[PDB]
Design a protein around this ligand. Structure first.
Ligand SMILES: NC(=O)O[C@@H]1Cc2ccccc2[C@@H]1C1=CN[C@@](Cc2ccccc2)(C[C@H](O)[C@H](Cc2ccccc2)NC(=O)O[C@H]2CCOC2)C1=O
Lengths: 99, 99
């Protein structure tokens, strides 16, 4: 599909059998989701944003369906304002900016 | 141009005579530029994202050229780590997300 930016680029993602709303974020290198339980081990990761750094937990090889497109990759869980789909997952579903 | 997301989507913008490097960010409602002097009067505003909030100066009706495409809108100036072009200006140059 082609998504214009007159409103927030929100999509519903399916993770762990449940639906969530996430924002397509080209300015985010990584995908960060709000607090939730994911399987396996996690390793630490410091990520910088607009207001500074935060420490999040990194989970690798996580199945996540974005707008019907299946992706398997790294997901970071931490105190984020909203679920953010970053470039690591945008490239997997073949997302590009055009103008 | 069609921009891929394998790398950060950085472009050259021209504002106040000088050329700068900015990140195209579909996740940002607004546009924030690093500390610089712009003419006109401003209003304080607090913006927040990952890491927390920062105080910025809001200037309205600022003219920016994004890849040659002129655009006009609200521009925030403050302690941001990178210049970020948000939705307010991306729509003006006809930028869309495709997948
Ligand atoms: N409210 C709103 O729309 O946007 C807010 C307010 C605002 C105003 C102007 C500009 C940005 C924003 C903010 C905002 C938008 N998207 C985010 C996420 C967000 C979205 C909605 C609400 C809160 C947070 C992330 C930016 O894309 C940011 C860009 C960045 C890149 C590099 C360094 C610093 C900042 N990247 C970043 O944190 O990178 C990472 C997180 C995972 O990988 C790393 C962000 O922080």
């Amino acid at each position: 599909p082609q998504i214009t930016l007159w409103q927030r680029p929100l999509v519903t993602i399916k993770i762990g059998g449940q639906l969530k709303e996430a924002l397509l974020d080209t300015g985010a290198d990584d995908t960060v989701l709000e607090e939730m339980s994911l399987p396996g081990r996690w390793k630490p990761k410091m990520i910088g944003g607009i207001g500074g750094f935060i420490k999040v937990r990194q989970y690798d090889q996580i199945l996540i369906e974005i707008c019907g497109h299946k992706a398997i990759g790294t997901v970071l869980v931490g105190p984020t304002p909203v679920n953010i789909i970053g470039r690591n997952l945008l490239t997997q579903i073949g997302c590009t900016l055009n103008f």
